[PDB]
Amino acid sequence: KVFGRCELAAAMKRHGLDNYRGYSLGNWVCAAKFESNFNTQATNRNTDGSTDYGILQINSRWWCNDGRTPGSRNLCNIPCSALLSSDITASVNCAKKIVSDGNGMNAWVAWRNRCKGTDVQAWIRGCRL
Ligand SMILES: [Cl-]
């Protein structure tokens, strides 16, 4: 599923990501935008042989199991494939865990480089929320 921008914002809010750990909805939307361009099926292989999955590019290195990342953890306790569904519940629950781990949204490099300190509100502009 490729979400629309306001469509995703509402899905994220519905799943209680808005202001989760103090991050406004616009941050989460910006993060989704630059991580997967809102596409729930996005996968990208990392140089270390791990793979990032889904709307938030959750990394098999720590967070999910894909069965091909030697020596990795599955800290969200899910198949990385669940991170690729139309329904974003699993991506949301697992992102909540990532974003609590100590570093806030800096765990997402696209957020740090492209969202952090920008006009993140604009991502939810015009949305019926
Ligand atoms: Cl593995």
Ligand SMILES: [Cl-]
């Ligand atoms: Cl923080």
Ligand code: NA
């Ligand atoms: Na893993």
